[model samples]
Target chain A: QGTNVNDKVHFTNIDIAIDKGHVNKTTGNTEFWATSSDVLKLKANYTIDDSVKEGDTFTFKYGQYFRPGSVRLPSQTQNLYNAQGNIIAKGIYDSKTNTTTYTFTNYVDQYTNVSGSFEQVAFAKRENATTDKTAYKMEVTLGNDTYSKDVIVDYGNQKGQQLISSTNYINNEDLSRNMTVYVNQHKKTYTKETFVTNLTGYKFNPDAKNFKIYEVTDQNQFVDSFTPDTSKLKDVTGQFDVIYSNDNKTATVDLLNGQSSSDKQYIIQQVAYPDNSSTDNGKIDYTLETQNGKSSWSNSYSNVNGSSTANGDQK
Target chain B: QGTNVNDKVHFTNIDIAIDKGHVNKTTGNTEFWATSSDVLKLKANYTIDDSVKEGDTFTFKYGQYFRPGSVRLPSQTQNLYNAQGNIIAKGIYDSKTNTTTYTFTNYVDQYTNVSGSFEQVAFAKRENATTDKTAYKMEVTLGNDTYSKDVIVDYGNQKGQQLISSTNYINNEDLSRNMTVYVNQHKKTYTKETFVTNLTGYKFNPDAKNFKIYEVTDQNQFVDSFTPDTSKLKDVTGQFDVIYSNDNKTATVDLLNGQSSSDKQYIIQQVAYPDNSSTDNGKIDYTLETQNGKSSWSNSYSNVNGSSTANGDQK
Candidate 1:
């Protein structure tokens, strides 16, 4: 019928490749945190060996972090534009490879010996990083030729390969603030993670000692709560200890001794008496830091007596 | 191979068919509620046209609400036992047909059957009733043969073909009780549902009025909340109004005037102060009822100070 998809001439004379890569972080230094928005983009200049033609499908593979954006006209697909405002290739998802592949198929414009650069093709999504490694490289491979692009990646607010990152849901009422902590641990066999939260400006409830740990989906869905106990079971099957200080100011949880290290999503729902009023316009600050293996990370919030999210400084 | 499946000798000579059917509702009345436990069962007598022989595979299809029970061995499959205490045919699910079929794949004992009747096989699950109508008849069908077996079906706490059934989640606090209403509308086309709650022992907080309807999963995972407005939009799309009475004592929701008739699962998170203390051992009673096109349904609760669920008399 039409031109065969990826029936390349293999013309060893022309230089066809991705010329340069660009990111939408045009403000200044280019880097993104682990919890960054999926709207982030990694655009590449697809310089052609010698322009393109109809059915002359040139294709390559990249990680699924930046998928084909579906905002444009040919809905559910990504269109790549050449230098002359022509679509040299269109992108479609390949479930087998978990990639949004760009193929030069059924193109409108055909050309002679003009090298073209297809622009703005990839976008980051909320899917987990394909690799357990902290860094992400935009490696595109087509036959024997390969083009590599890279961007700096950090975990949460921390600037390194963090195993655990703590986020909180401050359910504030009249005098109580239940800081529901969500620990998004990366898929790593860590030694242990000891969480230390300062209870300053907070009054502890005696019955609130039900410091049970719950496992949830990455999206905060409830799986089930871990059985809380004072005694740690040996090489055990069931319960784990809640290593609290018995002190009113601080509570901690260390799981290296009893619990499996690979449990990624953990939640702790603990309430604290804010020692403040329902209408008090004051600041409620607390630091939630975690020490894992060798490294550590922390992100705390400054609550304004009430809000979904206000300004929270990262430590 | 084993016996050819259904290689019959044109058994027009045998009186083989389902003799009788039984349900687990052991009480005097033989009926079940719409929201009854899926532990319900439908057992049928598998009387052979003649004594069972080897390689005889008899099959029929039934609704998905009562699929083959997986509690027995062959973890993902259901085992059917004969009157002589022997498994003649095992059950497996056919996804394409959405039915669990019974087949005599392997025979432990070559049934020189004296008319074998297989005992309890099908058990109910939380899957929806296959038909849009409320009647869930356990109709099993084979080549020209069909069996009739049905139980009384009621909607939630109310009985019969009710379009809407309302349940509430009481988020109790010191003086406030947030009765999050869950209106589960059946698949049938309905005109509209107007919900009326008698906030009796309740003091309605003026600020506690966010009567926005949220759509959730049958299991309560949030799909999305509706946009709240005072004025209804004109088939123009998007915004819908939350009709509230100036009287705080009684709040209502009438979708017939503003919203679409088809939006099935609706949730309204409205709070009411109990006018009583948190620890008070008094019952907080309230009724939530809905009127659809023709039929209306109501269910009320009696909260015992505080709990996930307490004894609520069905009205």
Candidate 2:
């Protein structure tokens, strides 16, 4: 289905597979179809694999169309599909090594062999796969208007994995990652600008502090910590001031919010603490502060830095 | 297992019935258990119902322990269950009156003959049973902090059913319903104050204007209209000013904010129009204005009433 259906009603076709044990000779190639406007349940004779019991249930996934595009004898033509030109089909099952094969069919096309295995769900028994790690839904309100989406995040286990790439930090990078998360399953990376353009009805704050990304844990907290790595992101030439606690365990990143004019210069500073014996861990705590203007920074903001701060150059 | 394990690890028993026709007698009471810390799958020999075909799957519900409480072998046992004293065992299934029963077993207790059927879902085959009518999840924010919970609302078909009872209105009412929704399914009304007190970490605005309730329709919209019947709400002696649109279809309720002191004398006004040629719907237009003191009301917040205004004394 196309994304825009206008005022007219439309339907989406679902591909199905006759279970291996239940495929009959006469109706072996029989096709089953369902519509987006309705929930149709189809029954087929089938057998269970070693991983799935008789009463166990899983979900079936097929290609989706946003809306109908044109008027034709077939009524709809533009479809996203597999190599066979048929709508690709898949299902969700929790199993190991059992590849269930299904048939993809439309009126004009048929894909004889479409296969996939059930995905391993971290929270199988939990309600609707909504685990503590998953961002099931979120809302952003700007004044009287509100925008909400049902988002899912897979931040696996106690020592949760990083949601966004540590290397690429940009405006609203974390927000973009969470919004377009389905595409980035299993540690796949998504860029900020690309995803924002692709998603509809969503605009993000460019403020780095508000560039939200989820921290993985049962607590389900979101953190904003993206220290720039100059070598990997050379074009990101902006300099931010960093301050560390005496113990070096905690640090803060202070940066301006928006694009600066060429004439505006920003000074980056770092202070070192003297200690005879020192050991450090990779873990660093960060606090973010956004300042408004470059002119204001030289007079007002500069005085806030520590007196012991070492020599730093303006970038 | 009980509610508390004293900050230590504990396991829950998962009973399985294999599908062949029915479970074999040898492994009849065979207990297969798993820890809450790990994902476990058990094989069972159970028969499929007619409504469910082969390869179809559903979810299983089990006991969840967030963290152990204090000072007992199993220190916690405030289980969320159906009111059968059974600590109800349930699952999602497609059933034509097929009763699928499972036993609930812990080391100390066993609830045999525990049974239920799959609830009919509107949006079937979807990953989650989230439909437009269901308030599956919602978030409420007060300034800097936010509170969110998974809510299930039954906004019935067409004219829709009452979500928040019209008689009562309060903040976080929708949230409380979702939190304790399992206890009251259909036609179970939750009053304004009772639910507010039962829920932890929530406070409501005393001003009636800040109270929340819902009106059901295909387009889910929030409305602020409570036409009073004096006898039913005796304590609510305050009168609100109202304004209606030209079409009389839309209206707004206007009222002042803050408490009225004993010495603050106020006046309520109403206008009446003569019959036959009257284009009015008997609903008069209104505007709200608050005065700092009773003496200022006659000078500052007067006028804006009809020509046939009547002398209405304040309570």
Candidate 3:
């Protein structure tokens, strides 16, 4: 063990345990030994809008790296809640970034009211195990100013696995990944026509052996149900060619059809294993970017097709 | 004839000619005399880019209304073009504004180049007839500075018709209008469960009995052939209601489906006089608005599906 003289803020301990017995969630393999690097500390900052006054409210948004079954607010963090005692927030993890964004709402400050706390602010439950975790320091803008702080983000041990496992498991069960579609006009006016030829995504197996592209017949719908409407799925695999980077972490889809003014949505599905393997089946749904001024990557998530179980396995 | 004693400008002695019979181009009908208000005069300004030096080339864009078949370069404005010839630029007309956008290219300013002249320049051809016309006064930007002048924009005789007839006639021959269709996250990422209903369009006949909405199956190909591949058409007309203002000048089509992130493009088409009526048998083609930031009208044009002619008569 390593510790500073005060032994309060810095410490390092190492351990070597024998087959204490743990089974891999998906592979069902026998566990051996595990190791971890030094706990890295990051500082997150926050700032309130200058105009925020006594009667005003504030909100802070940050990514949640760990996935506990549910997040429970602790007594120390009670000050960040609404009068009704409910916290304003939502989070979804990504394949690459593996972050679940928590949007915290409700606030009251007198001046450029800046408030923050460094504590074990919340708890999360995952895979039948409950874990306590330190909150992240964040720089968030409630009004105009950005506020920031340093909270703890643990990606270590059985605890760290809670975060990584959530994303890793979902990655194998789904092909959902954010995509960047280029457009020439103001992203706002951008439609399918402005969809230049490039389509890109990250964190998916670059070694993906098979790829399928689809155009949704119904622009309003998503593949929410386990059984998708076959009629709404128009297979457009032939329209674009797909390629994976050498590292296999990213994929690019190039449209042969050029671009137009119509806004189009595309679904990309791929399997990392060779033709008939049953591992790493991924599906990502992406829409052509359509905003003005700036272009970006947008949300991608697992198939909400109702039949999927908690582990993202099709029931 | 009209002129005042000390007439530097400002005199109105209108004329009334008997049997001044005129022919309407499309309707082949007799025409009565037309009148004009005071010759409204406005100064057009121009500014060139700051980076532009002497002998630098520039382009000026403006609308054309009255047309004289084929605008010719006048000697007084000869300095604006290359030594070999070609003084002014190009003009495109729009029905709504009734203006011709003339894009003038090539310029070599000897000095601050703030120079201009009043002359009957440029010529244009309309409906198989050629006519002479006055040049427009304009100041265009090649760089940053605003350059301007009072060239001439003739709205009289057959000249102005060159501009008017171009846009007016095309306006009636095509179903060029703007459309709006909503997409949900599924439209964005695409989810079947989420796409609510609604599709809309602006500035077309709401009571359009013969109206049709189309979704291009092949984004690269327009519905040009008279016999369109029925598979590409998405008849969502039943899902929306249409309403027109009392003046019948603007129309709105509201979708029953709510909006979403999926980029959607819709084609709006309408014929002026269903089947046989003769008045203003016009047709316009339009695509719904797609960009988000500054939402505005876009991409309305003549027949792309081909096969239509003569004020949009289905051939």
Q: Residues A4-87, candidate 2, lDDT per residue (tens digit)?
A: 111111112222221111112354432211100111111112112222212222322111111111000111111222322223
Which of 1 and 3 is the better model by TM-score? 1
Instruction: Give the residue spans of candidate 2 off by over 4 A.
Output: A1-238, A241-251, A256-315, B1-152, B158-315
Candidate 3 local lDDT, A1-315, one digit each (tens):
111112111111211111122334465543321111111112222333333333233322322322211111111121222212233222233323323333333232222333321111211212212122333333333223333443333323331110111121222234332221212211122332212122222244444434555665553323211112335678787776565554454455544256654445444444332111121223332333233332232322211110010011111
DockQ of each model vs. true complex: 0.01, 0.01, 0.00
Worst lDDT 10-window in candidate 3 chain B? B304-313
Residue-level lDDT of model 1, residues B1-315, one tens digit each, is: 234333331222212111111233444444444222212333233334343344555455555444433111112354454322345556565634645555653343333332322223343332344222244655545423555555443323321233333322233224344443445534344455666655544546656444455554443232111112213211211244544453466655564445465545554555565433322212223333344333433333322111110111111
lDDT of 1 by residue, A31-55 (tens): 5443322123332322344334555
Model 1 misplacement above 4 A: A1-315, B1-30, B37-41, B47-56, B63-76, B82-86, B105-111, B121-136, B142-144, B157-315
- lDDT score of residue B97 within candidate 1: 65
- Pairs of residues clashing in candidate 1: A16-A49, A46-A117, A51-A114, A66-A123, B16-B49, B51-B113, B52-B113
Give the per-residue lDDT digits (tens) of candidate 2, residues B143-254. Answer: 1122233323222122232212211111121321111011111222222211111111122223324322211221212211111222222222244334433333223332
Q: Which one wins by lDDT: 2 or 3?
A: 3
Judged by whole-model lDDT over C-alpha atoms, candidate 2 comes out at 0.20
Q: Name the better of 1 and 2 by TM-score.
A: 1
Q: Global lDDT of each model? A: 0.38, 0.20, 0.28
Can you give the TM-score per candidate against the true fold? 0.24, 0.17, 0.17
